[PDB]
Amino acid sequence: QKRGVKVLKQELGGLGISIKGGKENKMPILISKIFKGLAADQTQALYVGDAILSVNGADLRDATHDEAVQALKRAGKEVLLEVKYMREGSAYGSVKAYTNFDAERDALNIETAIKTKGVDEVTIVNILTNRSNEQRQDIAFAYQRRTKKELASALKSALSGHLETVILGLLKTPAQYDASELKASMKGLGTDEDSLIEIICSRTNQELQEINRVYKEMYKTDLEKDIISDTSGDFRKLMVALAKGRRAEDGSVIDYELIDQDARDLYDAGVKRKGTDVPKWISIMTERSVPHLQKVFDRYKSYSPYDMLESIRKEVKGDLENAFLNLVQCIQNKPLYFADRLYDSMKGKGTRDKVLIRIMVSRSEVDMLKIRSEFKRKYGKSLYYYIQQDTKGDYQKALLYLCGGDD
């Protein structure tokens, strides 16, 4: 949404910002920096990542960098800027950006809370679980600027138990967190198939593309190679195919003809024959776009007496079955998939904390609000309520904050 801000230039710093972009670089004119205590900082109506479209009437949407500089520099003291936030995000996450963010102040308050007698976990949780992920990155930088020590290591020494797992998870970037969760699922004498399946089957092309790049920076090896080392059979083939994150992109046209042929091919390769043509299932379910496969699964029910999920339970077993069942759920209704996994992690005796924590951290800024709607509608009470009964202490409070609230 396009909005207007009035800045009064000061002779020191002018507007008090830095800008990047220009049609020379296929970018708009974006606010790079906002200098503390200067003209733009005092309005508190401007954010980094904002695109400057106009300045006192002069358009800037197709302006080069120098054109924008001359325009911003030559404007009078009273400046009217047309500004729009061109940074992408998600409207359905539960954790939003804090409106009084000072990375240095939060860094100091966390340092005092770490060094407070007995460790003040309450303020550590009340800060970190009420900041966005990139705000947590700024806090980590300011903490290392002030203390010359890494915030992650400092919190790893002050915290313990399930709270340490939550907090250390929130500090990592989403790619870093998924990359390290995948590594943790394959490291050791075995493979946490349920964790590897949950991440590989639920991430999008763009999320997987960054995971693959970040995974090699952190571990100097390719994720695909670690997958090949820890898996075998058709399960390896499916995981490697999905982890590539090269699924077709949702186009604007609906291929009704291919929808029917895919539905036939799924039927012919599965419950119509004895045995299963597993490659045919892997090819269709990993390469077609998600909106296409949702229509294929409805067309499948026209040929098959069992739906895609029921057919999987009749056709395959073990880790391959679990993978396909997870994949189809993510294709059909990803928020409901996480609502069900959250339920399973808490419904029974004790808690599957590793699963509960991973979902509450990774989806808090993606679709937690949709997960909560699916959860409440299906199970009758809220995700918040189930977290209350299953967790206690500061650990519970942190998860409640990541949940965002009731219903």
């Binding site: 002018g14 910002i17 830095s18």
Partner: peptide, 6 residues
């Protein structure tokens, strides 16, 4: 990386 202060 092109960054100008105004």
């Amino acid at each position: 990386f092109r960054e100008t202060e105004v």
